[PDB]
Each structure stands twice: as C-alpha cells, then as structure tokens.
Write a protein that binds this DNA or RNA. Sequence first.
RNA 1: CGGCACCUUACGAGAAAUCAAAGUCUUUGGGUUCUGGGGGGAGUAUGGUCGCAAGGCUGAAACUUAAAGGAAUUGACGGAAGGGCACCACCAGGAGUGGAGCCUGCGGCUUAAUUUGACUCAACACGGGGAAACUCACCAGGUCCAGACACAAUAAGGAUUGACAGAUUGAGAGCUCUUUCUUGAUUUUGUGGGUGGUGGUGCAUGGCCGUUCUUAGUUGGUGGAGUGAUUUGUCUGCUUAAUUGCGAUAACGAACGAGACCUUAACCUACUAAAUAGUGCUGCUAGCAUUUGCUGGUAUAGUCACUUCUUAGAGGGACUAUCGAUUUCAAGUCGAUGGAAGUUUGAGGCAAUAACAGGUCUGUGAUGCCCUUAGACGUUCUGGGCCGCACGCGCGCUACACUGACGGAGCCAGCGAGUAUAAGCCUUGGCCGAGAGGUCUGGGAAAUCUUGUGAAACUCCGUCGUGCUGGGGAUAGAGCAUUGUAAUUGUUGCUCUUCAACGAGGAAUUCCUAGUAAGCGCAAGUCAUCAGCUUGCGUUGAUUACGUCCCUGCCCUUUGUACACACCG
Lengths: 58, 70
Amino acid sequence: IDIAIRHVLMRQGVLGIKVKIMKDPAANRFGPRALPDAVKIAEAKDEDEVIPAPTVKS
Amino acid sequence: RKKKVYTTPKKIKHKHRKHKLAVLTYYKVDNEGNVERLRRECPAPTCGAGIFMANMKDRQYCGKCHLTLK
RNA sequence: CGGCACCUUACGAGAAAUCAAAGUCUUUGGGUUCUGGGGGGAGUAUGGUCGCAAGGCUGAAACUUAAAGGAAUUGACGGAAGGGCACCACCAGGAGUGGAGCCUGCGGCUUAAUUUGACUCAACACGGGGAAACUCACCAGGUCCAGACACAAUAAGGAUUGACAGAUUGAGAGCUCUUUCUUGAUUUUGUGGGUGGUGGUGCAUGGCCGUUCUUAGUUGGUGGAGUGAUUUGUCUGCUUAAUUGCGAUAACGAACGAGACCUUAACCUACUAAAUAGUGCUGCUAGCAUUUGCUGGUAUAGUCACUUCUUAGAGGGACUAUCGAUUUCAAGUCGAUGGAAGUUUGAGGCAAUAACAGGUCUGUGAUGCCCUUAGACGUUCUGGGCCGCACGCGCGCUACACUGACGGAGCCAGCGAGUAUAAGCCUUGGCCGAGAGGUCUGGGAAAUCUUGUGAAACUCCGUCGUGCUGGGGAUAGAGCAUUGUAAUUGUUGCUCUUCAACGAGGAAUUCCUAGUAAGCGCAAGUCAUCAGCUUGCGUUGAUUACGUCCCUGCCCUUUGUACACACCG
Ligand SMILES: [Zn+2]
C-alpha cells in the first residue's frame, strides 16, 4: 500500500483527502510477490500409462 | 479575555527637529575671503572635514561618531 | 346429516398481515338492506324527538390544517425473554487502595493572575504541564514596526533614522523631556491592503488519538423467498481465544476482520566469522605446599589455535508430535512419553463496515469566520503567578516493626546514554573534602573509554529486644557546595539539630492465573539543577483456579414501538 494524505484548502474550510492504493502483489519485484496467506497449488502429474516390466538400454 | 487599560498619558515619539538651512550656522562666508570652519569639526578619524560639532552647554558633540570633548 | 371449530396448500385473492372465504371481482352483473368520501372542529352547536334524570336518536357550519392513517422492513431503544463471553465480572485466592504524613492532580477559596482543558467506565503522576528569565496564554509597568506593495500629501533650501551629558524611568530603554548635533529618499501622515495572535469558536473544521472494541464482527456474486423496502446465505447443537470450525442446512462458493503476518524471547556443541568477546595453549613473570600443581599479571606480534559459552546473518527446528481416553467418533478436549519449547510456544506491533456533538483551533508557515492589529490580544523587557489554604476526592510513596532496624563482612544483572573553537557531553584515574563538593590529567564521536555501570533486596556475622524503641521521619533552626543573568516563597544535596501522626485502617472498592502477582533496585525522558512520575530493564519469586453466568458489562437471537435529529426520543 502507498498512502498519501493532503489537506485541500477551500474558501470555507479544509478538505483532508487520503488516496490509498495498491499495486499488484504479483507485480512486486523486491518484496514478497503475493500475500502471506496466498496458497498456490500445482497440478497433478499422475494418470500415466504404466507397463509391467520393461528395460531400456541407452 | 480582558480589556487593556492604561494609566499614564499617551506618549509621542520624538520627531527630528527640522532646522531651516542648518548649513548656514557652520560657516561665515567672508567677502574676498576663505572658508571659516569656525565650528571645529570633530578630530576623530571617522569623520573628516565637513562634519562639525555642537557648541552646546559645557560639551561639544558630533552625531556622526558618538564622542564629546570638554 | 347438521354444527362449533382446527391443520396443511394456495387454484385464487389481498397493500400486506392474512384469507376455505376476505375465492368464483378490469375475463368487472345471484338478491337485497345499511354505511364511508383527507385530518380536526365534532358526534360539538342548533332544531326536533324519546327519557324522571343521566342521557339516547337525528345532526351541521364557520374556522383550521398537508397531511392524518394501514401493513410490513431495516435500525435505534426497553425499568421484557432466552443464550454467549470476560479477573477492565464472579468462584477460589494473592496483593492492594480506602486509616497518618508527604508529593502530585481535581473541585473549591483567595488572589494581580492564582491561566486553562478534561469530570463514571472513556475526568483527577493527563495535556509528555518536575512553571525562577523563557515556557505564559495572566497581572503592574517599557519598547519597536520586524505595517510588505500601489497610490495621494510632504520632501533635497533636507522626507527622516540614529543619538554624548542631566532629568525622568528600574534601567548605561535618545522611551520621553532639556540638547544642537549626525545619515540621507530605503524613509514621515492617510487610504486601501495586509500581517501577526497560547484570543474565541473541537457545538464551524481538517490530522491524530480515545471509545464502541481489539469485542468479533462486516460485505458482496450467483441462486431461493418477497410487489417491494429487504431477507436467506451470516444457523438448532457441539467446538474454539475468535462468524473458528464441525455440523445442520435454500443455499453454494467467496472477500475484509480474527487467524495468518511482523518485532522481540527461548533451543542450535550444525554453519559463517570474530585484536572493539572470551577460552586453552604459549612466552615472560609472580606468592603457597614445593608434586610437575593452585591461583593470578602481562603479551594491538606469542605476527598463538578456536567459536563452546559473548555478538549477529544465514539457516534449522513444533505442525498439538506419538500414545491412552471421552465427542455427533467429527470439530475438539482431557491425561501421559519425547522434546528446548505441547497455556494461540511466551509477550507485544498492525488491525474491518460505518460512527461519537468523546478530546484537542495551546503543535503547526492547518485552517474558514468573529475579535484585535501601532497606547497591539504581535513582539520584546523587568518584577510577580500558576506553589498561593477555612475543605472533599483520586494516581503514588513512606512506613506502621524482630520474616525488622542499624554496623560490619560478601557482591551478582540487564536496558540504555555520552563531544571540538565548542558555548561545553559521559567522565575514569590521580590529587584535596566527615560529607556534599573542589583541583590536575587522560579515554571515548564510541561492544574499546566512561562502566564488569561490583544496583538493592539478599547471605552471613554482631548490637538493638516489643518501648512508638535504635520502627517512622513530618514541622522547624544553624553552616558548606552545586547549577543558573538571577535559588527570597528553603532548586537540590550535604553536616549538625528538632524526634510528629502513624501500633495494619469502616462502609466500600481495584489489579491479577506463572517467572505472572508481589517484594528489590537500575537506565531514558522532561533537564543548567530538580523523579515520591512515567517509559524500559534486570534480581528474588509465590498462593489458588483452570470453572460459571451468581454480580457487572457487552454481544447475538426472540419480542414490543406512536422512536428514525433514533429515550438526551
Ligand atoms: Zn566625530
């Protein structure tokens, strides 16, 4: 989060504004590239074709 | 939260005393003569010629440099 | 058959609540009677009529008003019901406060001002507010323009500033008055215009903080209910510190908050290295029994070795691990063994949707506006005051004695801070001083030096021996230093001296479940001096729980409403 607070001076009073923004965590380059709780799961490599007992000479 | 009030009479700041043609009192221009320089300019090195003293009571003062003689 | 009704459903109706009729009504027609036409005035006046009367029946208008009202939704509120949680609640306990003195703040009183804000939790050792100048906003006195800039007047034959000595004044403020001196168009008068305020307005505001509440709560996408506002999801029960999960389920899958996360603390004989850390060796050296050892000094070249204890970067390790039990055999919980750690591992930081007439315009060159702005509410300067006491309240401490005082002997922590041409930092070490303090060197811009901060409690050995005693240290008198321009209304300490109440404190009420409570000291702060205060650290080190809704508080659900500026209605 980048936080910016500025006071705007009107003729009738003060307007204190706060523009609070985020860049994409995956767009971060130096710190963590996601939230702490971000759990990412890879895909399965199972469901292959298995054959009884071959032997390959290379 | 109070109204300010005075007791002494209101003062007036000192005004410079305007003298009409002050330069006349320093010299007595002699006919067919020289400059008089009667007023005995201060002998301090700070003020050279043209800067005179004040022939007052029992003191002689020049306002350029703050000194008195007799 | 007839009834008095009841349950479900909604073909259908309804604004909805609901309705077996309140259906068969814009697809408008079975018969028929009565009644209403916004709210009041008003079922009033009058007339008639009935009545013993009380009164009944019939029954206006003037005038006045933009609403009145019905059903339901959300919220708010309740001196309503049901659940849940919590040492800012209790059970069981520990220590307290409330008794005296003092310090300190609050109200009150006085004052020249005794500045003021805040007043249950969420006011009162809080405004980082321990005030001599300053702070200061207040009081008695004195200055300056440091009123920019456009103009108009004046103005070089001088717009005008500074001024010796004396008077005044506190002043060696030419501030002003006597004084005639000196610079010269920056300058003097007025207008605009400003500008500056610890002035007012936190009930005109921002920004921050506190509070609700750090409780666990909050929200939308798709689907379902509803004409809708909305609602379900977001919930009986169990579980958890927790809307956190199991589970049940017109819901399903998600997001914020919690948890995660981060800082700190623990373990690492496994790494990376450590002359600003230490150790074992190695020299050289010492004292004793001579046993070759026990203790030490030294060694920025012994040009020793190492990281193990000390530091900190990289990592690792715990995820309720495995087992016995109960549980919806789920979420979990309870007992063991291992482990360094099995209470979220310990303690903290950040911390949701909106909000409060909570606090601050006394921190701002943050402010809008009102006040004022040259005899200034601006500033500056001297002196005072916040300290002032017939009184009540609280945050603390000193203790009320022997689980103790003094007097010796022993003597361990940790967190931190510390400088130059200054405006004087930490100060050692030496030298003087009963003490406080004084003198001379030197180290350190820093793990080096200050400082192993050898802190106190504590352990021991002695006197004291129940006495207000030698427990206690108010109130007061005398000298020596320190700091500051300046200590009187004692800055403070020190030396001597005075030797107070207090002999454990009522009704009440506070904090707290483990290195925690409670004794005990130390450092950083405001600070030139002033700590009985906070902020942090370290030493010693417990009792009892490990449960509940009895009190209180909050939250949720049900319920009620004529409230929505929301009961301060
Ligand atoms: Zn001269």
